[PDB]
């Protein structure tokens, strides 16, 4: 709460999200991630401000 | 092994003070003098400082006999 | 008291045991919780070759053809005291496949 | 002069749920345990909270014997 900055990871090309946090206090800024979408078959993922 | 930060320890000859120095391992060829300075059972390697180098007219027997005049 | 004990998991219930001495090697295949050694191929019991790391190819073919001769395929491989390095005893017959 | 401390947690209700000599199915929890008081033997799997369950069905058996912990053995029927 108010340190975690709970967010969701975007498809980075079209649509989906992944719903896991990234801290604002510790400099974990712009963390790339590979995750499993439905259609695009294990492409890369990045953050969103929501 | 680990070639890298570990240097090759380039050979260099020390100036052979007390016999042959242990040979060319490090690149530091200079000593002051006298690698051993003695045979090392420490055979009184003195240079005669403030102690008994000057032994005339002190640490001697002056002013007469062995002092029979006491009582 | 050094031991690593990679032989403790035992999910697969059939393993190939490897012992590397400083002179030569020998290997067995054990069946778990029964205590019966099925087949084995031992250097200096069959005295194949002098160089100790050239043993692994000929004892790999020999233990492989004796394993297929005894009719066991689904085997495993232990790494108790030793690294998977140096001798490999690589094979292409039997379900170990490494 | 008031009551300092009078609250208590709700019990998570652990314990041995399937004793030996019992016919089971694939998936029955043999013991709900807090720590791993029982170690897995044949056909026994652990989970997240150290809970071990049966992989196959059969007559279960305990205590293969000690020196490492108590054992659970789901033994199949033949």
């Amino acid at each position: 709460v108010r340190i975690k900055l709970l967010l969701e990871c975007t498809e980075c090309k079209r649509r989906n999200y992944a719903t896991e946090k990234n801290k604002r206090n510790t400099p974990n800024k712009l963390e790339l991630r590979k995750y499993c979408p439905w259609c695009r078959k294990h492409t890369v993922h990045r953050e969103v401000k929501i | 092994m680990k070639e890298g930060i570990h240097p090759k320890l380039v050979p260099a000859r020390i100036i052979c003070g007390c016999g042959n120095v242990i040979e060319t391992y490090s690149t530091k060829p200079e000593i002051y003098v006298e690698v051993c300075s003695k045979c090392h059972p420490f055979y009184t390697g003195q240079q005669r400082f403030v102690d008994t180098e000057g032994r005339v007219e002190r640490f001697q027997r002056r002013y007469g006999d062995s002092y029979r005049k006491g009582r | 008291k050094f031991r690593v004990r990679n032989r403790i998991k035992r999910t697969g219930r059939l393993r190939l045991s490897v012992f590397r001495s400083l002179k030569h090697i020998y290997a067995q295949i054990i069946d778990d919780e029964k205590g019966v050694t099925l087949v084995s191929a031992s250097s200096l019991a069959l005295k194949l070759k002098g160089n100790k790391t050239e043993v692994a190819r000929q004892v790999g073919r020999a233990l492989a053809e004796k394993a297929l001769a005894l009719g066991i395929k689904q085997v495993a491989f232990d790494r108790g005291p030793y690294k998977y390095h140096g001798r490999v005893k690589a094979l292409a017959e039997g379900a170990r496949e490494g | 002069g008031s009551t300092r401390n009078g609250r208590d947690s709700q019990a998570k209700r652990l314990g041995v749920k399937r004793y030996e000599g019992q016919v089971v199915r694939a998936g029955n929890i043999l013991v709900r345990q807090r720590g791993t008081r029982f170690k897995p033997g044949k056909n026994v799997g652990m989970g997240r909270d150290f809970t071990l369950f049966a992989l196959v069905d059969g007559v279960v058996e305990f205590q293969d014997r000690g020196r490492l912990g108590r054992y659970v053995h789901v033994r199949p029927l033949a």
Binding site: - | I5, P7, L9, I22, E23, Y25, E34 | - | -
Partner: protein, 179 residues
């Protein structure tokens, strides 16, 4: 390669016969390893670690020592976890004799104290920390990296049991006596 090895082989191995030893092949005492440590000197020389004692230490013996961690944050001596402070090295090879024959012959002169070191510094199982004071003046280094006094600490570990069996070795190898 060869550095006082004749004194290593025919001034030790037959000299340990007829007065010491059980006179078989391996219980005659010998050298296993000689550990060498910095231990920061007195305290932390800097807030951030600088890694230059690996450079002048790699100059005097030609190898890098491992900078190892610290224990639990007791914080009476501003103790902390991480930011490693160890500077320990064993380095047992013939490279042991490469530096040990240098400091064996250069460190007993060229530093000033009472003549020699303790024969009471022997410990159980024969491992003998000798404990020189500083030697950054004349380890033939010519004042390179004079930050502080900044000594080091040596322990020459024998093989045998007793202090008379390490004492059988070390001053027949060339150590002083009675301080």
């Amino acid at each position: 390669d060869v550095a006082l090895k004749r004194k290593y082989y025919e001034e030790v191995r037959p000299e340990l016969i007829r007065r010491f030893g059980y006179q078989n092949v391996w219980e005659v005492p010998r050298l296993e390893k000689v550990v060498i440590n910095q231990g920061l000197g007195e305290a932390k020389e800097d807030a951030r670690i600088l890694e230059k004692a690996a450079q002048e230490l790699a100059l005097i013996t030609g190898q890098k020592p491992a900078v190892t961690r610290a224990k639990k944050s007791i914080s009476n001596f501003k103790l902390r976890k991480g930011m490693p402070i160890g500077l320990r090295v064993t380095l047992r090879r013939d490279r042991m004799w490469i530096f040990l024959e240098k400091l064996l012959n250069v460190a007993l002169p060229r530093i000033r104290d009472f003549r020699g070191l303790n024969p009471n510094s022997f410990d159980g199982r024969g491992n003998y920390n000798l404990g020189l004071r500083e030697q950054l003046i004349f380890p033939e280094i010519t004042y390179d990296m004079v930050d502080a006094l900044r000594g080091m600490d040596i322990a020459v570990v024998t093989t045998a049991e007793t202090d008379e069996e390490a004492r059988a070795l070390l001053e027949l190898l060339g150590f002083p006596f009675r301080k």
